[PDB]
Every structure is written in C-alpha cells, then in structure tokens.
Amino acid sequence: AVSELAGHQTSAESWGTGRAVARIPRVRGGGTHRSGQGAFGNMCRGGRMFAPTKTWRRWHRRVNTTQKRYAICSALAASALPALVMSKGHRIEEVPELPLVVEDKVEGYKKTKEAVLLLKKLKAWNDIKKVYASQRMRAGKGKMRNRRRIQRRGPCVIYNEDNGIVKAFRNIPGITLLNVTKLNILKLAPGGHVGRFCIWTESAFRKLDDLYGTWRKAASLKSNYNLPMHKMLNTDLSRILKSPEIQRALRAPRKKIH
C-alpha cells in the first residue's frame, strides 16, 4: 500500500473564482517553484493517487477442505496417464513406467552424486536437462525485485520419512520434495495445470491408501473423508456410441446436402 500521508502533507487552498486559474488547490505563498502550483488532486503533479491502496485489502482467499482434497486427488490421479504428463512438457519418453516407484533405500542417500546417478538410471534425467536448457533471465521489473532468474519446474519426489533424501535432492534444479502426509496442491499442479511427473517411494506409495482410502473403505487417517464418486463410469464415448445396443435404436442419418 501507499503511505496515508502521500500528497496531503502540503497546506494548499484553492484560489477562488475571478482568477485565470482553474479552481484547483494550490501551494500557499513562498518564493519557490512549488508555489501556487497544484496539489490534493489525482491529476496534479505530486498529488495523490485516486483511491489509495490500503493494507486491509482482502489479500487471502478461503477454500473448503473437501474441495482442496478433491483437487489434490484429481492432481494425484492425473500424475498417471502418460498423455497428460507429456502434455505438461516433461521428457518422459524413456521412463520405464510412468507411475515411477523406487525402493526405500533412496531415503538413505546423503550425496548429490547418488541422486543424479539414480535419476540417470531411472532415465528421468532428461527432465533435468530440459530444466537446465530453460534457465534464462526474467523479463520486466521482476529482475530488480529479487526475481531475476527463472527456470522450468522439474520432477517431483515424494518420500515417506526424511532420512537425508532432501539434502541429496536439494542441489538439483527443478526438483521439489514433498511428504506424503503434507502433499501440496501448489506443487503437485504448478501453474494450475493438472499434469505433473512425480517419482514415488515404495513406503510413500503404500501410504496413499492409508491417506485417502478407496471407495469401499474410509481414509483411516482423515477423520471423515472418502474418495469422490464418478459422475459417469464409462468415460470412453467412442465405445458407447458404436455399441450394438445404441446402434440398434438409431434412425438412418440424413447426410445428403441439399
């Protein structure tokens, strides 16, 4: 916000009618340039901005807990479906399996060389290569506001418990580390886009059913929560349209252009 005193620190009175001036408050007296000039107006030099910004703007917004869980579940489900991950731009071509789950020994890593070797073995290093190729200077006033460097977001690593894995996967650009019990939608869906490539750990992967549960079981870690129900089950429209049951109850189409 701007200062409350901005523009009103002067003592300016408007010269009355009968003078060539245009009825604007002007600086009183003095032998200065800033004398009989103009103040208190949004159109005047110095002046005061129209509707000055206030600190008590509604900066923070509120979202329902159930909707937040819905969104995080949708993002987690969209972490599958390699088409969506490819649509996010992640170089996932050579990854052996998109639901990439790795052993629990990764938490025991404590050096960056082990982390990069594991990433190359899993063939997820191409994402880091793309992140490296994406490093450049930001355009605009952000450079002088501690936002000079920008780069592409890379793969996300989800672990069950912290045993030094973060320090290993800390100096690799683009890698974000999340815990299963405190998954963040802001990092699972960067930019509001539901696609994201994630690397799972076996314990973290097994904890997913304990975190949210299935449709026939409760979460067992959230007091009252179940997975949302599907509005439609057979999502494949092409299979439904050409099904024999539908085709038996259709008229002959008219495609003769007149």
């Binding site: 002088m144 501690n146 000079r148 800390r170």
Partner: protein
Amino acid sequence: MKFNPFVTSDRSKNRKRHFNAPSHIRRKIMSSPLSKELRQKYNVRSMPIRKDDEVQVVRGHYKGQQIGKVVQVYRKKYVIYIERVQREKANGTTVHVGIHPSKVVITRLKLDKDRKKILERKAKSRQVGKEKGK
C-alpha cells in the same frame, strides 16, 4: 540455496554493502587466485592481493603470459596497477591501466610473517574440511 535468515540475498542491499565497504573489507574483496604451482604447494585457493606480488593478466586487452609486479593497490576504485600494464596519454605521458584483481593470477607471493600465518590458517581449515568430508 541460502538458508540463514540473517543473510542479505537482496540486489540493492548487496550492491550497497559492496560499494560502501570499509578499507579492511575491501582488502578481502580484492582477492586473486594463486597459480597452479602455488595452489599445489601452499594448498590455498586464493589470497588478497598485495603491493609487492608478481601478476599475470588473464582477461582483457593486456592478456598475456608476461609476469609483472604490482605498482599499487587502489582499494577505492577496486583496482590495482601492474608494472608493464600501462597506456600512453595524448601528451606521451604513461598511465597505468587498472586491472581488476579477479582477472589476475598470482605467480609469486610477497611472503611476510602475516602472509605465512594466513597461508597456514587457510591450509589447516581446508585440511579440517577434507577430514570432515572423509
């Protein structure tokens, strides 16, 4: 990534600290790397430049393999003057061309008691660090 909540990490503030540093801090700022032979011998990465060292220019117009003595250290301008790194003025007067210490490699140190103490401290700290690494 920096984690200490008492470091600057601010563009304007870091620039202000750099350009308003006192003389003793500017001495540490004006540091130059040692040669490969000196790095192997003393096990020291770099040392602050001094008035009586031998200097090779690594970058710039005067880049070359020549070895020149330091003439003076100008801490106000963050620059040093070298022996043969000089230019001719309009009237024929010779003027030293300033070379930043970061673009300079030391090939021979001016060893005094304090220089030896600094070398020993740096070597011992590096040894402690590598022992911690192992």
